[PDB]
Every structure is written in structure tokens, then in C-alpha cells.
Amino acid sequence: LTEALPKTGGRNNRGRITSRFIGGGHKRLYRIIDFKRRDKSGVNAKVAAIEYDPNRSARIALLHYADGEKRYILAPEGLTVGATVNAGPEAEPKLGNALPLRFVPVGAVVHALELVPGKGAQLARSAGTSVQVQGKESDYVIVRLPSGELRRVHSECYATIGAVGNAEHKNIVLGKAGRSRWLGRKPHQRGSAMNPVDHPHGGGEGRTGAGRVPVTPWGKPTKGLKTRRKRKTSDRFIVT
Amino acid sequence: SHYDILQAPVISEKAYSAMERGVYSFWVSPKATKTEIKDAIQQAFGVRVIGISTMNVPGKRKRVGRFIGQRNDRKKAIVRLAEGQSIEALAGQ
RNA sequence: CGAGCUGGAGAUACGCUUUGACUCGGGGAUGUCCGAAUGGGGAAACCCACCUCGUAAGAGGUAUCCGCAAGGAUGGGAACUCAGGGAACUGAAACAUCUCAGUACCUGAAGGAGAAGAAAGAGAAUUCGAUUCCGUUAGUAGCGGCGAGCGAACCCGGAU
RNA sequence: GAAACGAUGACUGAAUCCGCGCGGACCACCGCGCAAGGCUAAAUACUCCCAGUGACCGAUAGCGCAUAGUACCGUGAGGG
RNA sequence: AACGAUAAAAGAAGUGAGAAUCUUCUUCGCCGUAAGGACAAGGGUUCCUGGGGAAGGGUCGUCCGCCCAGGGAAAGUCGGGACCUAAGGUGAGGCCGAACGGCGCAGCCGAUGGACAGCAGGUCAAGAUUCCUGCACCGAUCAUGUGGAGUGAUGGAGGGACGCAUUACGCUAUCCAAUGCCAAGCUAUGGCUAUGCUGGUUGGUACGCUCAAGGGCGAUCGGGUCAGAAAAUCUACCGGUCACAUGCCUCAGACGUAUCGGGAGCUUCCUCGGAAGCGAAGUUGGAAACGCGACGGUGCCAAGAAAAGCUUCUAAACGUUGAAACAUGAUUGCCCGUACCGCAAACCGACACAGGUGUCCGAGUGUCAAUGCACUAAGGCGCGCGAGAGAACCCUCGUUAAGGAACUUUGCAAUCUCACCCCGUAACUUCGGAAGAAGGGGUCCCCACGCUUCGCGUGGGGCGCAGUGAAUAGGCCCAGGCGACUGUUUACCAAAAUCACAGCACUCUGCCAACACGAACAGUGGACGUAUAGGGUGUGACGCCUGCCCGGUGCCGGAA
Ligand SMILES: [Mg+2]
Ligand SMILES: [Mg+2]
Ligand SMILES: [Mg+2]
Ligand SMILES: [Mg+2]
Ligand SMILES: [Mg+2]
Ligand SMILES: [Mg+2]
Ligand SMILES: [Mg+2]
């Protein structure tokens, strides 16, 4: 049980319900996690403890850097209490060390991957997710992201050795409605159980369906929702 | 100034018997706070107040005439003086 | 002004008045608190401060936007004026262009009025000579699912 | 529309008085004007308020009121 | 027609023009986890006193929550402000927008949370942690004395700081019992003559070598600057030195002593009923919190506000000749709330309306237990028409010969069953269940003996038609459809086979994500998340499974 900030609940924007469903669940305080790790380069840290920290799905390791500054870090699958850890270019590719992709070997499994130097971790953060290094290009490294997509991440971006913790959300089977409620409000309200007024599927006389669409107009099974943007150049082979 | 503030003394059977124990009651300005009320009595009567308690009082009448009526609005201050009590000759009343 | 007055209040008491009350004109001086509201806060009319002078009482100051400053501005107006924005019912015996109509409404700015105004003009006389307003031209010329229907201007006569 | 002229959001972007704009595509000729700077009384519109008048009303009329935006209704706008 | 719940009433005495209805006495009946009592909201003088008697009061009023007049409401310590922050609101500057305006960091506003000093009694007709009496406490300013030097932000750190379930030990509030104590008298109907009957049986404070469960705590010298913007003697980290039991520190509460208080009643006067004076006893044993000791123990996953006050640090600063702190005087003590109604005749419901309304206290006997059920204390009330009669019919009830579903759309309705203990218990199954299956027996009173008690067990005896003797109080079973299950819904004709659900799938989305709100190159939600995540569609536990057709339509992919 250790220090953090309060994460007050909210399911609607500066007015009305914008992200559908979302509502119940326990109180939960926000724990500040170290995603950047750069300002602690060269300083060694000891894994004080791993902790149950909601807001995440992935475990959290309580780190103590020899200077006195205690920081929380995404605990990776394998990290134990007492195991030392360091950040920077001058840092070994060992369990829990933060080092840019240029110093990171090929085929070597990583997580907490950035996208722009500084900013912080943005890829493979959930438990069990990992990015595997494919092979260095120019001032960019090709990687295999959790989805299966290949991205050009510029070598200068930090990473953490190993796959993310919390083994597997598998034996977690919820079981009863209300385990869902311990977290988020009655989800999936069928649009076919709605009225012509309410949603496009809604209406008719009994059980049905006729054209396949979401809440508003669109269509959902197979329809490229992606834009014709810049980031497409720093990307290779999408599908799955 | 002094001489304003304390509008009138409190008449009633309870104020007259409170008098008999050196305790004086007045209808004062509803805005005239305890300290200002303390000073005004102290000066105008030439006596020291050892304690002061006060409270605001509402109104509302009509006998006849569709003139729904209206309030009046007071504040009643009740003071106790140190051992050598009495106020003027307007205490024996 | 010249004997009354003491508000409607018709009610008793106290009184005031030719050393000119009362009422009528016209200027002053007071003018709590809220309200643009303006020290800060606020569920108007309440709560809480700081500065300066001051014998305590008490008096003055503490909003933002223009500009050296002087000095100006915020808010309020029944309708009328111009501007930004701008419907539908309705009519077309249905309706979509069209109509209702740049009407209703909202919003901004302002005044006792405003707007507009001193020809890169009107129009065919090598006439006129800033603008507005009224008469008339004239339901003309023209517009128009050339349908419903819409509808000028010059000339000339006047207000100025 | 044969649709000129004004105006202008986007993109362009001239001449300087043997110059420039217009005269209902457009060209010639004839004719009327000086843009891209500003100010401006008067006649005109209205009626919160005041006065005068009326083949206007006179208490179910005339303003909603012989005075009330009250009583009363409504959470409120509002209605009365 | 009705006069607003079937919780009653009776008589006597009084008052008055007038009395079923107002007052007083004596009974009666009704509530008593309430129909008693204390708030909050809301209402606004309805409160008390004297008077009234037109309307209001479903009747009558001599009365009232009505009408008139007078009065009553007292705070340094209670609640709110002069303190703090949450959601939210606002917001100089800053980001957008035809106008009006929309956002938005710090800050500010905002309690429903944090913080913080007073307890016991007395008493107006009507106020009381507010007034009076007794004795406290808090802050500030100053006077005196001790101290003899530091004080220690707008900043740092510690602290405030927080779940759900279950539970060990001590306690108190509070409750019971008795041939404990104290007080008052008397009783007789047949008895008792007190070992009967009735009532009362200790609060505040101070001091105390007295008994005491339970709760709380490491101390100090160092090292790195790379951590807290900087500094720190503070805090974090690593290390060295004594950390078993103990050891410190605090004492819920009990006991003793003293003192102020209260205390059953007794007493004197009385303008009819109050006022004043006095004042006994303080036991032994049992029970006992949701309160207190306490931030205790254990277990669990869904992982349980912030900010100020507070404590500790240094920056700046004034300073060491007059410090901070302690101690004893004195002085000081602002504003608003405080009556009354407040599960209701004073609030919301047009109505003195069978409805609704958040919190707290809520006694005794009996009953495994209990805030259930019956009766009942304290207390409150008999519901603002009444009186007769004893028809049809209608409503709410009790019993019912013989029969027992023949009723009917349908056992609709109403019976039967009904608590606790012992015995006993089926198919089927997901191995939990089905189960309170089904069915049987016990149940009161006395005495003896045995034992873990309020008690229970064995034995013998007694009484009635009958012993959970009244009240509360499952009828059960076989088979099928649908839906797995708990759950949700049509406020006011539909509770369901609807919706949701755990689980499955297709699919989209690489992050300024897809998607969604929006004047908007604003802002925001998805998400302080990141593909073991998020959107959308469908199916709907679990088991076995999920086939054929790609022509048309849509979606993805090709391009000569
Ligand atoms: Mg008449
Ligand atoms: Mg009027
Ligand atoms: Mg905000
Ligand atoms: Mg009867
Ligand atoms: Mg007869
Ligand atoms: Mg079958
Ligand atoms: Mg079901």
C-alpha cells in the first residue's frame, strides 16, 4: 500500500455520454508510473516490491534508485524483489533495463516502447504483450508490435527488456454479471433489441437483422476506418 | 454615534423582573454588533458590561384591509453589569 | 402666495403659522443597502478584508477596457433607425424552383431621431446637377415551374 | 437568361490625362462621369411622457385594472 | 350520497345565553421499534398569556393549528462564517468562434467530507452545552517571574490518509434479581401480618503508592549527492552499532477519599392549586452494545478522496543588552442560526386528505434468537357528527350435516400445512445440489437423580378434548414448454418466454487510435488507457455440435 493521486470517475465529456456504457466500479486511486525513465540514466535501482495496481492489467514494480527517489515501473514477466536495474545507453540488455533500440539486439523481446524520444512508453503496456526487435535500418529500427504489424521506430526511442507481467488474463473468467460491474456498466445493449428511432437495427416484429451497421450510420465487419496520413511512411505491412 | 443604536428599552414582565437582578434589556439596531452595542450602553449610562447576549426578532400583522400585512424587524440586547449595578432612575420604573 | 396648515386617512393627541407657515416655481445640501455594480466573496439587498487620513466615532480609496494624462467607455430605454444572422405555417387548390419574406424572431450598435449624402451618377435631351421624403409615372417596362404570382426607374409636380 | 453594372469568400492582380469608368453580351462611333479618403444641418419615422380635441367607450363597454400586474395559478419562463 | 379507517366509551362535577362535543375528576379502551421521544429538511409565529366567537372546523362549540392584542427566542466552547478542500462551478493571462458566446492552467467559489475549546445541575406561562449556580477549557493582547539565547516561510519532508467481511479480550451506556439497604403506611374479601405489598437504590469534578484488559512505540553515529528547485540539523536510500520475551509510553474503565449535584419522599402556606424549605439509602450477584479501549486480530479483491490545521526542516529576515517556551495574574470574547411543528391537522400532496418524507434513541415479561409476535412501562392517543334499530342487498369476518373440485376458462378464492428438537428422506445431477424432499414422532405441570448454563437428559407421577394450549407460523408431489442462473422492464391495464447477464464469435483500431460530443486547426470523452487494450455488431451458462450455395447485394483485394 503506497503513495499516488486520485483518479475520479467520469464517462461523458464537457457535456453528454460520448463513450457508450462505462459507469460502475470500485474507487481506485491513480499510481504515477515511470514511462520515460530518461532522467534516471546511470543510476541503479533495487526492486523494492511488485504491487496490485488497478487502472492497468499489468503488474507494477516499486523501484528505488540509490539517490533516494522511489518510482513505480511496469513490472515485467520474470522480475523479482532485490534484482537491481539501471537505465541509459550505458546499460545491459537484462530484465527491466531501459535502453534505446540501437543498443537493443535483434530478436530480443521488449515492452514499454516509445514512439518519439522523450514522451514515454506507448507500445506493449498490457500484461503479456511484447515487441520483438526485427532488425536495424537507418536511424530507425523495424519491430513486431503485439498486433503483428511491423513499424519503423527510430532507434533513439527507449524500451524495457522482457515481456510485460501479469502472466495471463485467462484463469480470470469473470463468472457473474457484476464482476463486469466491479469495473464497467452494463455493456453491449443490442441495437436489435432497440426501436427504429433509437438505432438502425431496431424494430420489426420479433428477433431479426438487415444490412449490418453501428449505433450511428457506418458498417462494422470489415471497413477500413484508418485515415490517409503521414505515419503510413514509418509503417510496413498492416493486416492483423 | 452612542445615543442612536439603543432605540427603546424592553418593556414586558420578564425584563422588569430581570431588572431586579441588575440585568437590562434593550431593543437595539439589528446591524449594531455586540462590541458596538457594549460600548453604546457603557458610555450613555456610565456603567461596565460584564456580559452581553443578543438576538434578532421578526414581525407580521394585519387586523383587516386586504393589505396582506408585513413584518416590523428587531434585535434585543440583554446585558449584565459588575457588582455595582443599576441604570439611572429608569430601572425602578 | 396671502391664512391657513398639521400626506391619501376620513382618527385622537401635540403643535406650527402675517418676525409670512401650507402650497406652487427654481436651485442647493443630505441620500443606508442591492443593482453596470466597480475591493474580494456571494444563493441581490448580505458576508469578509486591506490602505490612507483620523480624537474613538467616523470620512475617503481599492473592477476591467482606451489612452502621457486630461477625459472617455461598460448598464438602462415603449416604439422608430441601421447592421450581423435569419424561419415555418401559408399560397402555388398536391410539391421541390418560386411564394409567405429578408416578414417573425435572436443578436450588435446608436440617437432624439436615424439612415443616406456632394456623381467613376441618372439617361438619350450633347437635358439634369448630393441625399431623404410625398404625389405621379404605373400594375407601365420588366420578372416568373412565363404558373401562383412579383413588380421598377427616368420625365414631370411638391416638402426641404 | 443574350445578363451588363454593383458587391466579395478563394485565386490572380492594370493603366496615370494622345490616361481611366460607365452607357444591359460584345465591337466601332457618338455621349455622360474623375473610384480605390473623411465630415455634414433640413424635410422623414416613432410615441414612455405632456397638452388639446372626438356623429370614441361609459362598468360583461373602455386599457388587463374607475387601478392590479394585485389576489390567485405555475418549479419556472409565464399566465391572470 | 356523504360527514375521511370498526382504536370505544361511560358517568359525575364545573362553566356558560346556549354544552354529546370546552374544563376537571374517576373508570374504560387503543399504540408502545410507536400511534413514545430527539433532530434535519421544509414551514413561518402556527410557540406562551389574556381575550374573541363572523367566517374557517365535514356536526356543535363556551374550544382550536382560526380572529385580535401583548410577550417569548439570550452561545468564545453547539451548527455555519471570519479555516480546508471533492464533484461541480468559475477563471487575469492563454486557446476557439457570424454576433450573443464556447473552452481553459494556476488561483478562487463550492460540504454532503477534514479541522477545532464545556461538562453537571437549576429554572419563565413560553429559551437553554445559549440565562443563573458550581467548577473547568481554548486562542489572542498585555503586566510579573523563571529562561538565559534564537525564532524557524509563500518553499521541502513527515502527518492528516480513509476498503469490504469476519472476529479475540476488557469495559461502559443500559437491563434484571434478591429475606442487601433506605423510606412510607396499610392492610380486612378465606388467608398473610412480613421472609407481605409499594417506591427509590448515585451523576460532574478533584486528588489518590489501589485493581486493570487492551492499545502505541525502535534509538544513535555515519556515507553518496546522483533524490526532495536551492538549502536543511528534516526526509528518502545503503551501511555500522544494542533491537527474542521483555522493555518503555498511554490508562477504556473499575475502586478509595473528598466535594458539588441530584435523589424516594417528607414539610409549611395557599387567592384551588402551585410556590418555597428539608432530604433517606447508595449493597451483593447476573446480563450487556452497533458505543468506548483502539489506527486491535485475521481474511479477501473489485484494491478503498483532497486540502488545510498539525509535527519537523532549512531560504530570506530581524537577533544575540531585552529569545522561544513555561508558570501566575489581568484583559478580551465578532456575524448568522437557536420559539413552535417536524412519519405530520403546522413539510409535499387544492382539503384538519388512510399516500409520501433523510437520520437518531426506542424500556419490561414471555417466546432458540430478534428492532418478529402477544400483553404491557414511560409516554401518547380514542382518529371533530351523534343517537336508535337489528329488513332486502353490499362489504370485512366466524362456524358449518352429508358429500369433497362434482365449481370453473382455470381449485380463481378460501381452507389445509405452519415454530423449534429427534428420526427419516427418492429420481436425477454440473457432484454443490435437488432437501424443509417425501414421511414419522416429540412438545404442558410436578417430583427425584444426573449434568455445560437461560437450561437440558433419564426416570416416576399428574390434569384437560386439546400442551409452538392464545399471537407470529411452508401444503406437498409427478410430468412437460420457455428462459441456464441472481438481476431488469412498460411511474398509472403487460414482470414475461422481454432486456441484461457470465461465456462465444465476426470485425475495426499502432495512438493527436478507431469512435463520439462540438460554432471550432478550440476543447473533451475513449484513456492519465496502448492490441492479453479500446470501439461496434451478433449470439447468450454448460455439454455435444454448427452443414450446403459467393449468382444478386454489401465488404476486402486486383487493375490490362
Ligand atoms: Mg350598471
Ligand atoms: Mg398596470
Ligand atoms: Mg476546472
Ligand atoms: Mg350509527
Ligand atoms: Mg319501532
Ligand atoms: Mg422433449
Ligand atoms: Mg429468466
GROMACS .gro file of C-alpha atoms in nm, chain B residues 2-77:
model
   76
  242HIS     CA    1  -2.370   5.646   2.101
  243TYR     CA    2  -2.724   5.792   2.162
  244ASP     CA    3  -2.871   5.625   1.848
  245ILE     CA    4  -2.831   5.237   1.840
  246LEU     CA    5  -3.037   5.168   2.162
  247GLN     CA    6  -3.384   5.253   2.025
  248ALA     CA    7  -3.603   5.160   2.321
  249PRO     CA    8  -3.588   4.951   2.642
  250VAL     CA    9  -3.764   4.616   2.652
  251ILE     CA   10  -4.096   4.653   2.845
  252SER     CA   11  -4.258   4.308   2.936
  253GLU     CA   12  -4.298   4.133   3.279
  254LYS     CA   13  -3.976   3.936   3.226
  255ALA     CA   14  -3.749   4.236   3.163
  256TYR     CA   15  -3.882   4.414   3.479
  257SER     CA   16  -3.802   4.111   3.693
  258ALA     CA   17  -3.460   4.080   3.517
  259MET     CA   18  -3.402   4.445   3.623
  260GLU     CA   19  -3.446   4.335   3.991
  261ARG     CA   20  -3.116   4.136   3.949
  262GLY     CA   21  -2.918   4.408   3.764
  263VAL     CA   22  -2.992   4.274   3.411
  264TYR     CA   23  -3.104   4.530   3.150
  265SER     CA   24  -3.275   4.460   2.816
  266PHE     CA   25  -3.292   4.694   2.511
  267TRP     CA   26  -3.425   4.698   2.154
  268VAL     CA   27  -3.121   4.798   1.951
  269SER     CA   28  -3.031   4.843   1.582
  270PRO     CA   29  -3.022   4.498   1.412
  271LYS     CA   30  -2.690   4.591   1.248
  272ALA     CA   31  -2.529   4.723   1.574
  273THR     CA   32  -2.292   4.430   1.668
  274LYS     CA   33  -2.216   4.310   2.027
  275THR     CA   34  -1.900   4.525   2.075
  276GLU     CA   35  -2.065   4.843   1.940
  277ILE     CA   36  -2.374   4.759   2.147
  278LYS     CA   37  -2.145   4.708   2.457
  279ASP     CA   38  -1.974   5.048   2.404
  280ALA     CA   39  -2.303   5.239   2.347
  281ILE     CA   40  -2.457   5.109   2.674
  282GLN     CA   41  -2.126   5.166   2.866
  283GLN     CA   42  -2.099   5.534   2.766
  284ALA     CA   43  -2.468   5.664   2.769
  285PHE     CA   44  -2.533   5.500   3.116
  286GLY     CA   45  -2.188   5.520   3.282
  287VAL     CA   46  -2.153   5.150   3.376
  288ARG     CA   47  -1.937   4.849   3.270
  289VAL     CA   48  -2.088   4.547   3.094
  290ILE     CA   49  -1.958   4.208   3.225
  291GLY     CA   50  -2.168   4.015   2.973
  292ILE     CA   51  -2.387   4.071   2.665
  293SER     CA   52  -2.625   3.842   2.477
  294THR     CA   53  -2.840   3.945   2.184
  295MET     CA   54  -3.076   3.814   1.913
  296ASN     CA   55  -3.268   3.927   1.601
  297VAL     CA   56  -3.655   3.929   1.612
  298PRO     CA   57  -3.913   3.913   1.313
  299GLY     CA   58  -4.269   4.088   1.266
  300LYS     CA   59  -4.603   4.019   1.064
  301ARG     CA   60  -4.959   4.159   1.127
  302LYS     CA   61  -5.288   4.297   0.967
  303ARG     CA   62  -5.633   4.346   1.151
  304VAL     CA   63  -5.847   4.389   0.829
  305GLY     CA   64  -5.796   4.550   0.486
  306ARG     CA   65  -5.679   4.313   0.209
  307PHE     CA   66  -5.329   4.462   0.286
  308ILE     CA   67  -5.180   4.115   0.343
  309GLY     CA   68  -4.969   4.282   0.608
  310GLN     CA   69  -4.589   4.294   0.657
  311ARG     CA   70  -4.317   4.247   0.918
  312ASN     CA   71  -4.158   4.507   1.168
  313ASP     CA   72  -3.794   4.359   1.241
  314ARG     CA   73  -3.587   4.399   1.566
  315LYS     CA   74  -3.276   4.282   1.775
  316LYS     CA   75  -3.285   4.251   2.156
  317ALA     CA   76  -2.972   4.303   2.364
   0.00000   0.00000   0.00000
